[PDB]
Amino acid sequence: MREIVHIQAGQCGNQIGAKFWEVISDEHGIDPTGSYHGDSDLQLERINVYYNEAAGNKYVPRAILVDLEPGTMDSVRSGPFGQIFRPDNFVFGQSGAGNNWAKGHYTEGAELVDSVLDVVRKESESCDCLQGFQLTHSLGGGTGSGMGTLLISKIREEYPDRIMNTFSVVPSPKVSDTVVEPYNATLSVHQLVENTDETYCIDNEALYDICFRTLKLTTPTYGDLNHLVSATMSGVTTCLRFPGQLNADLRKLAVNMVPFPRLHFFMPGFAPLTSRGSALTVPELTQQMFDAKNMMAACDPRHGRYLTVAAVFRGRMSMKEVDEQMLNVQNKNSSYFVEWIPNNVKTAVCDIPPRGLKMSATFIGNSTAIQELFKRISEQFTAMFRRKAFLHWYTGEGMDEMEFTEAESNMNDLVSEYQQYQDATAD
Amino acid sequence: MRECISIHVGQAGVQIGNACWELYCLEHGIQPDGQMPSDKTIGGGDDSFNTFFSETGAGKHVPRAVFVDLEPTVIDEVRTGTYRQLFHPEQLITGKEDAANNYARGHYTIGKEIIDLVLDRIRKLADQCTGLQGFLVFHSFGGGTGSGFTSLLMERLSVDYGKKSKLEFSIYPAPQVSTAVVEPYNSILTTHTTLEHSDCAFMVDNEAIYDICRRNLDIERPTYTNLNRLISQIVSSITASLRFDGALNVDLTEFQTNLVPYPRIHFPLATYAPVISAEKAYHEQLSVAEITNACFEPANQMVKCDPRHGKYMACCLLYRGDVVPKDVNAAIATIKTKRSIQFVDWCPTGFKVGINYQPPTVVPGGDLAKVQRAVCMLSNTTAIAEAWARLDHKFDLMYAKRAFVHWYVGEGMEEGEFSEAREDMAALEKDYEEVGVDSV
Amino acid sequence: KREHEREVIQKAIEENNNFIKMAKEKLAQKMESNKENREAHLAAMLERLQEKDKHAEEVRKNKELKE
Ligand SMILES: CC[C@@H](C)[C@@H](NC(=O)[C@@H]1CCCCN1C)C(=O)N(C)[C@H](C[C@@H](OC(C)=O)c1nc(C(=O)N[C@@H](Cc2ccccc2)C[C@@H](C)C(=O)O)cs1)C(C)C
Ligand SMILES: Nc1nc2c(ncn2[C@@H]2O[C@H](COP(=O)(O)OP(=O)(O)OP(=O)(O)O)[C@@H](O)[C@H]2O)c(=O)[nH]1
Ligand SMILES: Nc1nc2c(ncn2[C@@H]2O[C@H](COP(=O)(O)OP(=O)(O)O)[C@@H](O)[C@H]2O)c(=O)[nH]1
Ligand SMILES: [Ca+2]
Ligand SMILES: [Mg+2]
Ligand SMILES: [Mg+2]
């Protein structure tokens, strides 16, 4: 089969990691000690993508859990489904990085990195035909961001030809008070633009606004943000996990979604938006996922163009209806689709609906609007760095200033590259 | 005495292969275990169906067929399906990792890992033939295996079999069912690579078949199974001349003589009639004239293009079932004199016709009505060039910005291969223009 | 006439042989050239990554060179 190896790192990576496994295990119909008790054979057809086989017909997440904090490890083992992870697959450090990227990437992270690689090798080597890797992490802390991007460099060295996928959570002042996040993020993006094939942009600014503004949540928690992140992750991996024609593995998705090697950052979308504790039509579904309010990155799609889009509809609905509505959507919105990439929206229909939803929609867009997110990160980075603030935290670890410049301007190049393709015409 | 070997390549080739073999079994009275009660020669014979099936001493009739995919899940269904006892496991070849919609992987990276094994299994089939006629290759233009593997295979078969004819049935991509944005790239690359190696190619436009299912069979959202059943009828009409014999049967190679005026101009347009559901056929024979005229209606074509805006260079008709010469002659004379059909001035305006008495069959639980008489027409029209122009334009839109090109370069290709392929297509389009201009 | 008949079948054979030879040749040049391109493209990716290792020792050396 075509196995994915999952890696979660830092507090965030591990929170969203766990929910993902909670959700998809439910979907595939398996209990907290890994026994199948589902009612449909489609739950097992491609179960190996995400799970190994055990004795006694026990299924085990192909997952590797990492943090420089030993703490989050225990709070993972405590949650539901904490008892399913292979116990050798936990790899924890001593200190914690305390929001310092350089610690994550060069020093403390480096010292732990080799022991992570060992578990990755163990998993990989067993694999019949490994498709590649997915990493969940945040970009504002020190472990998820710095150690996570180191891990990625290191894995790409040993598996140069497998696909490398991240779920990257981007920082917002609205959610974390740390002044230093724009540093951790810019240095992260610098690594990702070189070393990942596809990166899902989960923006905490977007997730906060949906929870406050749309979902009526009063003071929204992390659990509240993570509810959205897991719905999204379930949606974007459906195609990987159940049988189907379209984007059925990582390379096929990349090939459909990434027209230029550096433009590999997607805004995901979902409809209907909900929180925990209490049906749309095909046309509402369809209109909603092309709407700025349903985007997990804080970008207005009407401020750019799509290079490529995948849509995934779930639930027992009419295929002819989805086809019509999808055509409809492209006709009424033709301006926002680059004309020089024909037939650039693809559509998948999966009968299996998610949890307590009769029908839903997930959207994955490679839009030139995502530059908004980078420009915002850029404005923050440069507010400080100009007044060389807090630099001492990083240089102290051996980093030169130059590395900051290079990363700043690699992300500027990126922005201006999106703009270039937003502007291009057919003649 | 002339065996044909079928090669089914990638998901489309393979799935169309099952539909075709299933249907051939039904046509010839061969059961899913290979036994054929009505065949009195056990272990061999030189009957007409032996061009497509060999025979074991145990009386099993085995397809002269290889199935190839770079990934196992499609062929796995054939290994465990209804027809799993039809094929020797050696005729079913799979790798572990597919071409990811990327011609470059099917041709070089992944394909090169399995090409000698495939040649090898083909050579086992060739070796059991007393008078090997050639090959029929089934494959999509759009997939990575369908495109890059097939073209690699075609190159190597030219080297290992020189003489031997090779016919293609190629699935041409449609947006209603396609799965890759780079399908225009794969299609232009495979056409350029395959053009010198193929003798005759039948394009099946997935949009044309999709629409025929919607409109003539009232299927709301046609699936592969739906399209493959219809496509299987067209393929069967075309191979019928090799699989049966009869006093009025004209052999596929004779049609070929008429259909290919110049080596590069070898893409016939197929039109099939009647495609009619059971409910609508109840209390309705369509006569010879009716089904014949229906070959000149573009809604029945298997590529979208318009022959009323181009010129014919050949026109062949393959009738099956309850059909007699008096009626064919009369129906064609009518079309002639009703002047609806224009030939290039360098080509006589005749109609080569064949008739096989065997009536068409349908697979159980399908959507096609079973009819008395059907007809497949093969024409060579300058209009088939339209299909190439639509693809060439999509190619051009993407390639001017090098969109997606990095995926091919990362697998070893050079931009030079792209522009060389596309120039070859520009030339093919000039060719179909030149043959249509009046002589001096 | 009989010498001409002989030339004709000879020409047939020759042109067929030459078609095979050219195809073998073009196939083999394309394969080895594709092999080289793909090697280069992987060599460069790995050395970029090697240069990340040099730079990361260089960042750690520089740290411990601070008293
Ligand atoms: C005053 C400091 C914070 C309490 C608060 N506000 C701020 O940080 C300030 C206030 C205004 C100026 C700039 N902003 C950024 C805040 O609401 N924060 C940090 C929350 C996060 C916080 O929410 C509160 C108010 O309790 C936390 N939530 C959890 C949490 O969800 N824990 C769950 C488990 C969990 C999950 C993820 C991480 C840790 C623990 C447990 C259950 C209850 C659940 O699922 O909801 C832990 S800390 C959101 C912005 C995400
Ligand atoms: N008519 C028909 N078309 C198909 C079928 N399966 C795939 N296609 C079409 O074929 C093209 C996709 O190519 P595939 O044959 O699936 O690809 P492949 O040859 O397996 O190549 P990789 O998956 O890239 O290794 C698209 O145009 C599909 O619409 C089928 O069963 N019938
Ligand atoms: N959505 C979401 N964001 C988080 C979560 N935990 C932390 N964050 C954000 O993560 C960033 C800090 O990274 P964190 O994971 O705590 O640092 P690490 O442990 O060094 O990887 C800040 O931007 C937080 O606001 C979470 O569980 N969900
Ligand atoms: Ca016999
Ligand atoms: Mg931390
Ligand atoms: Mg395939």
Short mmCIF file of C-alpha atoms in Angstrom, two decimals, chain A residues 135-338:
data_model
loop_
_atom_site.label_atom_id
_atom_site.label_comp_id
_atom_site.label_asym_id
_atom_site.label_seq_id
_atom_site.Cartn_x
_atom_site.Cartn_y
_atom_site.Cartn_z
CA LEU A 135 4.18 16.89 10.00
CA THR A 136 1.77 18.79 12.29
CA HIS A 137 3.31 21.76 14.08
CA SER A 138 2.88 25.43 14.92
CA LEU A 139 5.21 28.10 13.52
CA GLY A 140 5.31 30.56 16.46
CA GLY A 141 6.86 28.44 19.30
CA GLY A 142 10.36 26.96 19.36
CA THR A 143 10.06 23.18 19.07
CA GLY A 144 7.30 22.74 16.43
CA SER A 145 8.77 25.51 14.38
CA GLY A 146 12.60 25.12 14.78
CA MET A 147 12.97 21.51 15.61
CA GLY A 148 10.16 20.65 13.24
CA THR A 149 11.90 22.36 10.30
CA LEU A 150 15.12 20.66 11.24
CA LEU A 151 13.50 17.32 11.33
CA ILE A 152 12.21 18.08 7.81
CA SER A 153 15.61 18.91 6.44
CA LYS A 154 16.93 15.78 8.00
CA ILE A 155 14.23 13.42 6.64
CA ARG A 156 14.52 14.96 3.15
CA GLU A 157 18.22 13.94 3.27
CA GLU A 158 17.33 10.28 3.79
CA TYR A 159 14.20 10.07 1.65
CA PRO A 160 14.93 12.74 -1.04
CA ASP A 161 12.19 11.38 -3.24
CA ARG A 162 9.22 10.88 -0.86
CA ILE A 163 6.55 13.56 -0.45
CA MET A 164 6.85 16.00 2.45
CA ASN A 165 3.56 17.51 3.76
CA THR A 166 2.96 19.94 6.66
CA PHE A 167 0.04 21.20 8.63
CA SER A 168 1.48 24.49 9.77
CA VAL A 169 -0.26 26.71 12.26
CA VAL A 170 0.50 30.30 11.77
CA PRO A 171 0.65 32.86 14.52
CA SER A 172 -1.70 35.75 15.30
CA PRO A 173 -1.29 38.49 17.95
CA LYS A 174 -4.97 37.84 18.65
CA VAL A 175 -4.16 34.43 20.11
CA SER A 176 -0.66 34.53 21.70
CA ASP A 177 1.04 37.40 23.44
CA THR A 178 4.62 36.33 22.61
CA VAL A 179 6.46 39.18 20.90
CA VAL A 180 8.90 36.87 19.31
CA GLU A 181 6.51 34.78 17.10
CA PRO A 182 7.19 36.75 13.82
CA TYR A 183 10.79 35.64 14.19
CA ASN A 184 9.88 32.02 14.70
CA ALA A 185 7.48 32.08 11.76
CA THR A 186 9.71 33.88 9.24
CA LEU A 187 12.55 31.50 9.96
CA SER A 188 10.17 28.56 9.63
CA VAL A 189 8.74 29.68 6.25
CA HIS A 190 12.27 30.14 5.00
CA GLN A 191 12.81 26.42 5.62
CA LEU A 192 9.43 25.27 4.36
CA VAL A 193 9.58 27.09 1.00
CA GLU A 194 12.69 24.99 0.32
CA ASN A 195 11.97 21.67 1.93
CA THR A 196 8.28 20.77 1.78
CA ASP A 197 6.26 19.71 -1.24
CA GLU A 198 2.89 20.86 0.10
CA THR A 199 2.04 22.99 3.16
CA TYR A 200 -1.48 23.53 4.61
CA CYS A 201 -1.69 27.01 6.09
CA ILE A 202 -3.78 26.94 9.27
CA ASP A 203 -3.91 30.57 10.44
CA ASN A 204 -4.71 31.21 14.10
CA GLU A 205 -6.04 34.67 13.06
CA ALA A 206 -8.59 32.95 10.84
CA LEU A 207 -9.44 30.38 13.45
CA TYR A 208 -9.87 33.03 16.15
CA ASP A 209 -12.13 35.19 13.95
CA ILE A 210 -14.41 32.27 13.02
CA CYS A 211 -14.84 31.43 16.70
CA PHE A 212 -15.43 35.02 17.95
CA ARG A 213 -17.25 36.63 14.97
CA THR A 214 -19.01 33.72 13.29
CA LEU A 215 -19.42 30.99 15.92
CA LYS A 216 -20.53 33.40 18.69
CA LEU A 217 -17.83 31.98 21.04
CA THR A 218 -17.27 34.36 23.83
CA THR A 219 -13.68 33.87 24.91
CA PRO A 220 -12.59 31.04 22.57
CA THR A 221 -10.24 28.32 23.89
CA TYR A 222 -7.46 26.28 22.12
CA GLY A 223 -9.85 23.32 22.17
CA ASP A 224 -12.22 25.63 20.21
CA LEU A 225 -9.61 26.44 17.48
CA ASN A 226 -8.56 22.79 17.36
CA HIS A 227 -12.13 21.76 16.64
CA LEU A 228 -11.85 23.51 13.33
CA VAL A 229 -8.31 22.31 12.69
CA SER A 230 -9.38 18.69 13.08
CA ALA A 231 -12.46 19.09 10.82
CA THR A 232 -10.16 20.54 8.22
CA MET A 233 -7.50 17.77 8.56
CA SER A 234 -10.21 15.14 8.30
CA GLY A 235 -11.45 16.83 5.10
CA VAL A 236 -8.12 17.24 3.37
CA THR A 237 -7.10 13.63 3.96
CA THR A 238 -10.34 11.92 2.98
CA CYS A 239 -9.02 11.36 -0.51
CA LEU A 240 -5.93 9.70 0.97
CA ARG A 241 -7.87 7.36 3.21
CA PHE A 242 -10.90 6.07 1.35
CA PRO A 243 -11.13 4.68 -2.11
CA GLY A 244 -11.50 7.17 -4.90
CA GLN A 245 -10.14 8.42 -8.17
CA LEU A 246 -8.86 11.79 -7.44
CA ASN A 247 -5.86 12.98 -5.37
CA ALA A 248 -5.71 9.47 -3.94
CA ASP A 249 -2.13 9.81 -2.75
CA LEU A 250 0.32 12.54 -1.84
CA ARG A 251 2.23 12.73 -5.12
CA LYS A 252 -0.97 12.97 -7.23
CA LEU A 253 -2.22 15.76 -4.94
CA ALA A 254 1.09 17.66 -5.27
CA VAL A 255 1.14 17.20 -9.00
CA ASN A 256 -2.38 18.58 -9.30
CA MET A 257 -1.87 21.38 -6.80
CA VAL A 258 1.65 22.70 -7.17
CA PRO A 259 2.35 24.36 -10.54
CA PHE A 260 5.54 26.06 -9.28
CA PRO A 261 7.85 24.39 -6.68
CA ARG A 262 7.87 27.31 -4.15
CA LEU A 263 4.10 28.02 -4.49
CA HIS A 264 3.05 25.12 -2.34
CA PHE A 265 1.05 26.86 0.42
CA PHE A 266 -2.70 26.15 0.48
CA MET A 267 -5.64 27.76 2.12
CA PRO A 268 -8.08 25.15 3.30
CA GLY A 269 -11.77 25.84 3.71
CA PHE A 270 -14.62 23.98 5.24
CA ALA A 271 -18.40 24.09 5.35
CA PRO A 272 -20.53 23.98 7.46
CA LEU A 273 -18.55 25.81 10.23
CA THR A 274 -19.56 24.43 13.71
CA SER A 275 -18.46 24.21 17.38
CA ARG A 276 -19.04 21.20 19.72
CA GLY A 277 -22.72 20.57 20.86
CA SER A 278 -25.38 21.29 18.13
CA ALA A 279 -28.31 20.23 6.83
CA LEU A 280 -26.92 22.53 4.07
CA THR A 281 -27.75 21.98 0.44
CA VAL A 282 -25.26 21.30 -2.35
CA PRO A 283 -25.67 24.85 -3.58
CA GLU A 284 -25.13 26.30 -0.05
CA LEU A 285 -22.19 24.04 0.62
CA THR A 286 -20.76 25.11 -2.76
CA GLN A 287 -21.23 28.84 -2.23
CA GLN A 288 -19.83 28.68 1.33
CA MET A 289 -16.49 27.07 0.59
CA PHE A 290 -15.66 29.83 -1.94
CA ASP A 291 -16.43 32.49 0.69
CA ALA A 292 -13.80 34.32 2.65
CA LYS A 293 -15.46 33.48 5.91
CA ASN A 294 -14.90 29.77 5.59
CA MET A 295 -11.11 30.05 5.00
CA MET A 296 -8.67 28.73 7.66
CA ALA A 297 -6.19 31.34 6.52
CA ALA A 298 -7.03 34.99 6.90
CA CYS A 299 -7.06 35.78 3.22
CA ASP A 300 -9.71 37.09 0.95
CA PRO A 301 -9.82 34.81 -2.10
CA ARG A 302 -11.39 37.70 -4.00
CA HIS A 303 -8.12 39.52 -3.50
CA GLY A 304 -6.24 37.05 -5.65
CA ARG A 305 -6.75 34.21 -8.12
CA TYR A 306 -6.72 30.46 -7.70
CA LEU A 307 -3.92 28.63 -9.44
CA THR A 308 -5.54 25.30 -8.50
CA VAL A 309 -8.38 24.08 -6.34
CA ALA A 310 -9.56 20.71 -4.96
CA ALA A 311 -13.06 20.34 -3.51
CA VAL A 312 -14.25 17.39 -1.49
CA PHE A 313 -17.89 16.71 -0.82
CA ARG A 314 -18.93 14.15 1.79
CA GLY A 315 -22.39 12.67 2.44
CA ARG A 316 -24.91 10.86 0.28
CA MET A 317 -25.85 13.60 -2.24
CA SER A 318 -26.51 13.73 -6.02
CA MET A 319 -23.40 13.61 -8.15
CA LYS A 320 -25.11 15.40 -11.05
CA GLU A 321 -26.05 18.21 -8.57
CA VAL A 322 -22.41 18.66 -7.40
CA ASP A 323 -21.20 18.69 -10.98
CA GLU A 324 -23.74 21.39 -11.93
CA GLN A 325 -23.01 23.50 -8.84
CA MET A 326 -19.26 23.23 -9.35
CA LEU A 327 -19.61 24.35 -13.02
CA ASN A 328 -21.90 27.10 -11.81
CA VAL A 329 -19.36 28.30 -9.30
CA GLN A 330 -16.59 28.54 -11.89
CA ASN A 331 -18.72 30.42 -14.41
CA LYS A 332 -19.96 33.07 -11.96
CA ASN A 333 -16.44 33.45 -10.51
CA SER A 334 -14.28 32.99 -13.64
CA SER A 335 -12.16 36.11 -12.98
CA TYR A 336 -10.74 34.51 -9.82
CA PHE A 337 -9.38 31.45 -11.63
CA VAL A 338 -6.21 31.86 -13.63
#
